[PDB]
Design a protein around this ligand. Structure first.
Ligand SMILES: C[C@@H]1CN(C(=O)CO/N=C/c2ccc(OC(F)F)c(OC3CCCC3)c2)C[C@@H](C)O1
Ligand SMILES: C[C@@H]1CN(C(=O)CO/N=C/c2ccc(OC(F)F)c(OC3CCCC3)c2)C[C@@H](C)O1
Ligand SMILES: [Mg+2]
Ligand SMILES: [Mg+2]
Ligand SMILES: [Mg+2]
Ligand SMILES: [Mg+2]
Ligand SMILES: [Mg+2]
Ligand SMILES: [Zn+2]
Ligand SMILES: [Zn+2]
Lengths: 325, 322
């Protein structure tokens, strides 16, 4: 119906993903992954039975928490769809193999599964079982990977059943490398390295990038998914505002637990003392723009419209903050 | 029943650790740990109730597998005692705080707990739940930490209950850093970085190392426990001979599991095609001597005898190659 109409924008930045969630009966991850797999002809390329794909996707989506305001299946679908757009950027045309493409999209799909709605630092500070299990290192991200892969074991869920042994091993490695890179404590290091990759990048005649070793290829995929994960402020203001609502609700809920426990309340987690405009402008100035501006450098001019929206949105949120002229 | 005469060598390289295991009713880890804590006055320094220490040690010791030939409670006891000796080296006099000392010894004690007797690569290749949990990265070492820490939560087991919050946090971080560095896959990088530290070491006149910050200190602790972990070929030969027998028995059993599942048998795990003596020489030539030579540089001349024993032991296995 209208859903197939909205799913026509799947190759477009700014998909009305929230609308798709409503219309699909809260199955945005399932329908968006399925649509993209059909789009990229992935079921045929990797001999994936459709009933298997759908069974896994539905189980995966089930394992995103409905009561978590931001880190849920809608965010997962959004990051999947955004990665799907970035993969098709002209500067990267026929750079990546079908397997690499599959890896980046699957990584995006599972990258926050079973997120509890609180940060790594919170989990470390409250001595959680998760932090105990993972020795305080990329606690959530290791966990997302473990669950995402574990779900492949469920009945009629192995979407990779017809990959070769070599392919499955290569895909597992790439997906691990990608999701671990979504850990924000690795952001400055990724960014610092991506800047250096940009400085010395090599391009063909028709302008596509030359990535001639796994280390360069995976670095580009890591930053790609990281950008997609941090892409909310680059979306039309109507989508962006909605993402901002959810992240602050999730944060304030974390803040509430912290205050109730007598802990120091984490930054931007205090519902009483917090400005949306100030927090978002800071977020953009110190994290999202430094990154997207570097990505735009890498694929210039492919991302200029994305960068323009980001800068517009930044200008928009700073406009109501009083400042010295 | 004593035993006490054996434990008089707890400060020496080449303590009779197998004897201690026998004499103590297979509680070498509890006994040696208890002895070292008393000697270093750690119970008083950190207000560790002695029954809490023993209770934790017995539980920890119970989670090393009796039926694993090498990676068992005797190996843990050995690595603890070896670290205990290395910490007392003159070149390191007054370098470490009591909390750092506590961290290195605790890390040594838990560093292989619940080892199943197969390698990281075997756990990965067989798609074990453990490799699934830890995403193929330092699978065992991540698991050893989780278990060692988890056991503090059993009844009357929290030996760190009277550390401050800041002390617990700092000790936790050091222990994690130290145990993750026992992963053999990190050996070449760790050693490379150790050589770099050695190239630019600072010492007082009496040769005492001057460490500047957490980076320096934890790097020395990591390498120290790694050396202790790889110390078998530097021990008196009779000790070394038994360690060699044990590690081969454990490797062969992994090989047997591999052969049975039609997997390629891992290097040195095929009992039908092994060259034990030749493999010890290569082990020393390519891993153990390059490490201990660098450590010996760091603490010159504290480790000269250790190095000499290493070279004598290399010649033993060389001369027993059929
Ligand atoms: C560098 C760390 C990152 N961080 C995280 O929790 C992990 O990732 N964040 C994702 C994120 C995603 C969307 C956000 O808003 C909108 F785009 F929705 C957003 O805006 C918040 C809202 C207050 C500012 C940060 C954050 C915490 C942060 C304060 O600084
Ligand atoms: C299952 C294996 C695990 N692995 C390791 O490196 C683990 O670390 N080793 C410790 C070790 C400790 C003591 C050894 O001898 C004596 F000193 F005991 C010893 O003898 C080696 C080993 C056979 C000759 C060289 C090894 C390597 C891979 C094939 O898969
Ligand atoms: Mg995440
Ligand atoms: Mg003192
Ligand atoms: Mg080990
Ligand atoms: Mg220094
Ligand atoms: Mg001689
Ligand atoms: Zn995310
Ligand atoms: Zn060990």
């Amino acid at each position: 119906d209208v859903l197939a109409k909205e799913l026509e924008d799947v190759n477009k930045w700014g998909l009305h993903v929230f609308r798709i969630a409503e219309l699909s009966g809260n199955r945005p991850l399932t329908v968006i992954m399925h649509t993209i797999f059909q789009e990229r002809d992935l079921l045929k390329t990797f001999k994936i039975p459709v009933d298997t794909l759908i069974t896994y996707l539905m189980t995966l989506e089930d394992h995103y928490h409905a009561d978590v305001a931001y880190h849920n299946n809608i965010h997962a679908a959004d990051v999947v769809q955004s990665t799907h757009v970035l993969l098709s950027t002209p500067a990267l045309e026929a750079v990546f193999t079908d397997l690499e493409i599959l890896a980046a999209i699957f990584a995006s799909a599972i990258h926050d599964v079973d997120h509890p709605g609180v940060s790594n630092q919170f989990l470390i500070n409250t001595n959680s079982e998760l932090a105990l299990m993972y020795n305080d290192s990329s606690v959530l991200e290791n966990h997302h990977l473990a669950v995402g892969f574990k779900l492949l074991q469920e009945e009629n869920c192995d979407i990779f059943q017809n990959l070769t042994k070599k392919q499955r091993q290569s895909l597992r490695k790439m997906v691990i490398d990608i999701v671990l890179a979504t850990d924000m404590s690795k952001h400055m290091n990724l960014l610092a390295d991506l800047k250096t990759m940009v400085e010395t990048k090599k391009v063909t005649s028709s302008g596509v990038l030359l990535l001639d070793n796994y280390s360069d290829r995976i670095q580009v995929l890591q930053n790609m998914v990281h950008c997609a994960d941090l892409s909310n402020p680059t979306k039309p203001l109507q989508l962006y505002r909605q993402w901002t609502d959810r992240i602050m609700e999730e944060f304030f809920r974390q803040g509430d637990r912290e205050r109730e426990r007598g802990m120091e309340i984490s930054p931007m987690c205090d519902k009483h003392n917090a400005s949306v405009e100030k927090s978002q402008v800071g977020f953009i100035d110190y994290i999202v723009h430094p990154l997207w501006e570097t990505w735009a450098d890498l694929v210039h001019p492919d991302a200029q419209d994305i960068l323009d929206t980001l800068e517009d949105n930044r200008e928009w949120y700073q406009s109501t903050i009083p400042q010295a002229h």
